[PDB]
Design an enzyme around this catalytic site. Structure first.
Site, PDB file in Angstrom:
ATOM      1  N   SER A  36      71.024  49.403  51.282  1.00 53.40           N
ATOM      2  CA  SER A  36      71.371  50.061  52.531  1.00 53.40           C
ATOM      3  C   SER A  36      70.920  49.316  53.773  1.00 53.40           C
ATOM      4  CB  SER A  36      70.796  51.480  52.566  1.00 53.40           C
ATOM      5  OG  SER A  36      71.443  52.265  51.594  1.00 53.40           O
ATOM      6  N   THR A  37      70.164  48.221  53.633  1.00 50.44           N
ATOM      7  CA  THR A  37      69.738  47.487  54.821  1.00 50.44           C
ATOM      8  C   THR A  37      70.924  46.877  55.562  1.00 50.44           C
ATOM      9  OG1 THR A  37      69.214  45.639  53.352  1.00 50.44           O
ATOM     10  CG2 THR A  37      67.372  47.037  54.063  1.00 50.44           C
ATOM     11  N   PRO A  80      66.697  51.016  57.510  1.00 48.73           N
ATOM     12  CA  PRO A  80      65.508  50.238  57.156  1.00 48.73           C
ATOM     13  C   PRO A  80      64.879  50.750  55.869  1.00 48.73           C
ATOM     14  CG  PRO A  80      64.897  51.867  58.757  1.00 48.73           C
ATOM     15  CD  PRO A  80      66.397  52.028  58.536  1.00 48.73           C
ATOM     16  N   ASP A  81      64.118  49.868  55.217  1.00 52.41           N
ATOM     17  CA  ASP A  81      63.356  50.238  54.027  1.00 52.41           C
ATOM     18  C   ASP A  81      62.170  51.105  54.441  1.00 52.41           C
ATOM     19  OD1 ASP A  81      61.865  50.431  51.682  1.00 52.41           O
ATOM     20  OD2 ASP A  81      61.784  48.269  51.340  1.00 52.41           O
ATOM     21  N   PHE A  82      62.206  52.389  54.074  1.00 55.03           N
ATOM     22  CA  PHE A  82      61.178  53.334  54.504  1.00 55.03           C
ATOM     23  C   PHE A  82      59.872  53.199  53.729  1.00 55.03           C
ATOM     24  CE2 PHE A  82      65.200  55.737  55.413  1.00 55.03           C
ATOM     25  CZ  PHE A  82      65.123  55.649  56.787  1.00 55.03           C
ATOM     26  N   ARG A  83      59.830  52.384  52.676  1.00 54.00           N
ATOM     27  CA  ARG A  83      58.595  52.126  51.946  1.00 54.00           C
ATOM     28  C   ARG A  83      58.087  50.708  52.178  1.00 54.00           C
ATOM     29  NH1 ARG A  83      57.542  56.085  48.036  1.00 54.00           N
ATOM     30  NH2 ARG A  83      55.565  54.921  48.015  1.00 54.00           N
ATOM     31  N   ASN A 138      67.048  56.050  47.527  1.00 55.64           N
ATOM     32  CA  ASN A 138      67.384  56.155  48.937  1.00 55.64           C
ATOM     33  C   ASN A 138      67.662  57.601  49.314  1.00 55.64           C
ATOM     34  OD1 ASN A 138      67.245  53.375  48.865  1.00 55.64           O
ATOM     35  ND2 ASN A 138      69.466  53.077  48.934  1.00 55.64           N
ATOM     36  N   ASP A 167      69.450  58.250  52.330  1.00 59.95           N
ATOM     37  CA  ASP A 167      70.347  58.095  53.471  1.00 59.95           C
ATOM     38  C   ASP A 167      71.732  58.701  53.275  1.00 59.95           C
ATOM     39  OD1 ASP A 167      71.771  56.128  51.844  1.00 59.95           O
ATOM     40  OD2 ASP A 167      70.254  54.664  52.452  1.00 59.95           O
ATOM     41  N   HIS A 210      64.137  60.472  45.020  1.00 60.11           N
ATOM     42  CA  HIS A 210      63.240  60.901  46.084  1.00 60.11           C
ATOM     43  C   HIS A 210      63.904  61.924  46.995  1.00 60.11           C
ATOM     44  CE1 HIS A 210      60.377  57.186  45.757  1.00 60.11           C
ATOM     45  NE2 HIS A 210      60.169  58.092  44.819  1.00 60.11           N
ATOM     46  N   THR A 266      66.385  46.867  44.642  1.00 56.32           N
ATOM     47  CA  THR A 266      65.061  47.445  44.445  1.00 56.32           C
ATOM     48  C   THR A 266      64.107  46.373  43.948  1.00 56.32           C
ATOM     49  OG1 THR A 266      63.758  48.978  43.082  1.00 56.32           O
ATOM     50  CG2 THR A 266      65.896  48.277  42.227  1.00 56.32           C
ATOM     51  N   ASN A 280      69.540  41.180  43.813  1.00 61.27           N
ATOM     52  CA  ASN A 280      68.475  41.471  44.765  1.00 61.27           C
ATOM     53  C   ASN A 280      68.133  40.197  45.513  1.00 61.27           C
ATOM     54  OD1 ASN A 280      66.710  43.658  45.690  1.00 61.27           O
ATOM     55  ND2 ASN A 280      65.010  42.384  44.958  1.00 61.27           N
ATOM     56  N   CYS A 299      72.757  41.900  48.447  1.00 67.00           N
ATOM     57  CA  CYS A 299      73.366  42.795  47.467  1.00 67.00           C
ATOM     58  C   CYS A 299      74.878  42.872  47.645  1.00 67.00           C
ATOM     59  CB  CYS A 299      72.748  44.189  47.565  1.00 67.00           C
ATOM     60  SG  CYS A 299      71.009  44.270  47.072  1.00 67.00           S
TER      61      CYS A 299
END
Ligand SMILES: CCCCCCCCCCCCS[C@@H](C)[C@@H](C)C(=O)O
Ligand SMILES: [Zn+2]
Lengths: 292, 7
Positions: A33-34, A39-42, A113, A115, A132, A207, A231, A261
């Site tokens: 999703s970037t 953005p990567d929330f982790r 994700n 989103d 999540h 991932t 990746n 990706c």
């Protein structure tokens, strides 16, 4: 001695068009999703735990802990307004998974994700394990009520800076993401127990396989099942201080395609003869979203 | 069910 004739993307594509490859599980993370602007929330480089000073948190992680949120939800919702995407346009990778679905190949997409882009791209609830949770729906937090609200309702509250409250009982309404301290979704464990008896191919996209229990899913595949990683960086190998085997003389089923990706999914689609179908799908859906 | 944590 192996299902892949060679440990390359070409080997995976030939396997996907053989009689043996019927059921694909996708495992996807922030890397898909970037390119959609999410953005990567982790990722510490996202700086979620920076600029939290005005909220006077007992510890930075409290802004995503369920017990703190339920007593002090305003910091989370102020941050949610700051980070709310300007558009929800799924990527080539998301639409590649829609093509898998269209062709009867998608057993399940497990996503880290939140989103909603899998759903916008046309994956249905039955196709998805949102490990999540998701912003797609929100619920009243009162156990006796649990009124459900759509994202349009929640977006309006976030943007008007009104703490969302249930119309039935005036309790807090929370997006259906799993906060720290909340139970992980029962569906994650239920589907895992069934799906990995049935899988012919694992597609691991976007991932780094660093967050549990999601990362452990790769170890649930049968020993013969090929696993393709698409990746930016190699991931999933065993930690030498304490897995995927791409590169040893014992490697037999794991393939790493290192790059963006979207480009990896495009390359795989092209090998499969799906490039025109994927281009046509993406261009149509993007045009539809742009026209909203 | 297991609870969600940092790791
Ligand atoms: C993209 C849909 C709307 C997004 C609205 C802004 C994000 C709000 C901040 C969420 C970041 C942390 S999530 C984390 C606690 C969950 C997924 C676990 O791990
Ligand atoms: Zn309620």
């Amino acid at each position: 001695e192996r299902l892949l004739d060679e440990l390359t993307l070409e080997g995976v594509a030939r396997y996907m068009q053989s009689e043996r490859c019927r059921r694909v599980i996708c495992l996807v993370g922030a890397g898909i999703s970037t390119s959609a602007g999410i953005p990567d929330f982790r990722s510490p480089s996202t700086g979620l735990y920076d600029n939290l000073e005005k909220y006077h948190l007992p510890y930075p992680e409290a802004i995503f802990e369920i017990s703190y949120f339920k007593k002090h939800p305003e910091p989370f919702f102020a941050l949610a307004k700051e980070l709310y995407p300007g558009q929800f346009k799924p990527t080539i990778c998301h639409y590649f998974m829609r093509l898998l679905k269209d062709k009867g190949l998608l057993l399940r997409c497990y996503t880290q994700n939140i989103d909603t882009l899998e759903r916008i791209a046309g994956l249905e609830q039955e196709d998805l394990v949102e490990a999540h949770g998701t912003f797609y729906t929100s619920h009243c937090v009162s156990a006796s009520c649990r009124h459900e609200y759509p994202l349009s309702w929640m977006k309006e509250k976030i943007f008007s800076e009104v703490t969302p409250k249930c119309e039935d009982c005036q309790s807090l309404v929370k997006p259906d993401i799993v906060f720290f301290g909340e139970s992980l979704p029962a569906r994650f464990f239920s589907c895992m127990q069934s799906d990995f008896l049935k899988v012919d191919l694992l597609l691991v996209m976007g991932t780094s396989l660093q967050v549990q229990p999601f990362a452990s899913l790769i170890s649930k595949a049968p020993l013969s099942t090929p696993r393709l990683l698409i990746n930016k960086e190699k991931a999933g190998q065993s930690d030498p201080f304490l897995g995927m085997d791409f590169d040893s003389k014992k490697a037999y089923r794991d393939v790493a395609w290192l790059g963006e990706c979207d480009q990896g999914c495009l390359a795989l689609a092209e090998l499969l003869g799906w490039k025109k179908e994927l281009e046509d799908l993406v261009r149509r859906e993007h045009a539809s979203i742009d026209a909203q | 069910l297991p609870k969600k944590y940092g790791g």
